[PDB]
Amino acid sequence: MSEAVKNLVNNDLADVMFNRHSVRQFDPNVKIGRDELQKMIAEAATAPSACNLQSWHFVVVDTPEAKAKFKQAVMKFNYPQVDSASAIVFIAGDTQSHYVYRDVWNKVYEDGNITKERLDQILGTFLPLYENATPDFLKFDATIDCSVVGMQLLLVARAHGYDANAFSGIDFEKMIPTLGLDPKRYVPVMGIAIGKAAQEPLHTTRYDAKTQTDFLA
Amino acid sequence: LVNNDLADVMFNRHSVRQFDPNVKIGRDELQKMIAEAATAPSACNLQSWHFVVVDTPEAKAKFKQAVMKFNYPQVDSASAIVFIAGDTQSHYVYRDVWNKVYEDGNITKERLDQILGTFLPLYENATPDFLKFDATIDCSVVGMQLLLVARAHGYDANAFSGIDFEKMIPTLGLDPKRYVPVMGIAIGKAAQEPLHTTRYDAKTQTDFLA
Ligand SMILES: Cc1cc2nc3c(=O)[nH]c(=O)nc-3n(C[C@H](O)[C@H](O)[C@H](O)COP(=O)(O)O)c2cc1C
Ligand SMILES: Cc1cc2nc3c(=O)[nH]c(=O)nc-3n(C[C@H](O)[C@H](O)[C@H](O)COP(=O)(O)O)c2cc1C
């Protein structure tokens, strides 16, 4: 069908966004390949981010063993989503994303896409704020980036014909180590559970019973 | 919707900072765009966002007192700016709103009790910082949807947080014990190439004297 290859099988914006609902029970018989998961994550990461630092990090949970480990830091209220989802994409904030600030915006200049003067405005203005920032503010900054990419991922999920639930009902003191992520670096934000919505039970047919009946003579 | 192509809207979205200052957006349409954006999810459906629409020279002058000067091109040229602040008292109606979902027949009493017993204590016993974090997340997802809604409507937009975080909420006239500032959404039509005007054929305006 046409709207793929825009690679979006539901490319109707109004339907995708305005008929979006949190789905918490998915069809456990449908699995999403990791290649399509990577595709959806890349599509979501077209999202904006402060100073284009893209301060998000994704951890994909899609095996029974990964789920059992993941659930250690997830509130039991949210076990239905985790158990039934094809995959959970957990989003953590990168509070060291500004370490590459100067190099990154220099690359834009070296590519001839901004003037030297423009580059100097960008470096002069925002880099010192990142460099002198408190932990709380870096966490705040990273949390915003993670939320806008999470929002896009919820839409991307539907554009691929799936559905999804965003959730932050987690153990915030345990999630980062549970994911094996650098606690110095990463802050937990939200999980995105993804899969096919749980459907209505199949209504089966019957042969006409006259076919399976004899009257004895 | 002018542009209902999701791939185009989302994947061809760019931050636009220089808008056409002759183009204005009616407050009626601004309201419709905000409503469309607030279809966004929010934790416990508390919808902990608050919008302050800035669209007059007087309002812009007030607003800029808490905006970094780097972001003046956006604020000055935009048709409107929608600033999004987080409501850290959003959980005050927690019990009431989720009771209502129960009374209207859409959750079981057992389900309501699970919901109330699990998350309501977390909000009521939350640190200021946790309520701030919670409302920031809500504010950011509706902010992301508003960026997309602007393009669906044929406009363009820029999200920005280069502001004075201490001055902004009182600059908006909001209660700083209740509201936390998150980001602005400048909305407008992107600047377009200058008009290439025509000329009369100059022979029409020329005489050769006899
Ligand atoms: C930050 C955030 C955290 C959320 N956490 C949970 C969660 O822990 N468990 C859950 O079942 N739903 C969670 N949700 C889903 C919301 O309850 C849901 O978005 C809201 O009730 C509105 O319903 P809708 O998404 O279907 O429009 C979360 C949503 C957001 C934005
Ligand atoms: C949280 C946040 C704050 C931002 N603040 C500003 C800002 O203060 N000034 C500005 O010009 N752009 C701001 N931006 C826009 C980013 O610089 C832009 O998203 C990024 O460079 C990626 O470019 P794109 O939006 O064109 O995809 C902000 C974006 C985000 C997500």
Ligand SMILES: CCCCCCCCC(=O)CCCCCCCCC(=O)O
């Ligand atoms: C410590 C962080 C404080 C708030 C940060 C807000 C983000 C600031 C930005 O994203 C502005 C980055 C500059 C964008 C690049 C300029 C565009 C180039 C051009 O249009 O000529």
Ligand SMILES: CCCCCCCCC(=O)CCCCCCCCC(=O)O
């Ligand atoms: C860990 C501390 C913060 C957690 C807050 C996360 C928000 C929690 C939620 O949004 C869940 C609210 C209840 C939703 C219930 C929806 C109806 C359930 C059903 O379909 O039966």
Ligand SMILES: [Cl-]
């Ligand atoms: Cl098609």
Ligand SMILES: [Cl-]
């Ligand atoms: Cl695949």
Ligand SMILES: [Cl-]
């Ligand atoms: Cl628990």
Ligand SMILES: [Cl-]
């Ligand atoms: Cl410098």
Ligand SMILES: [Cl-]
């Ligand atoms: Cl300044």
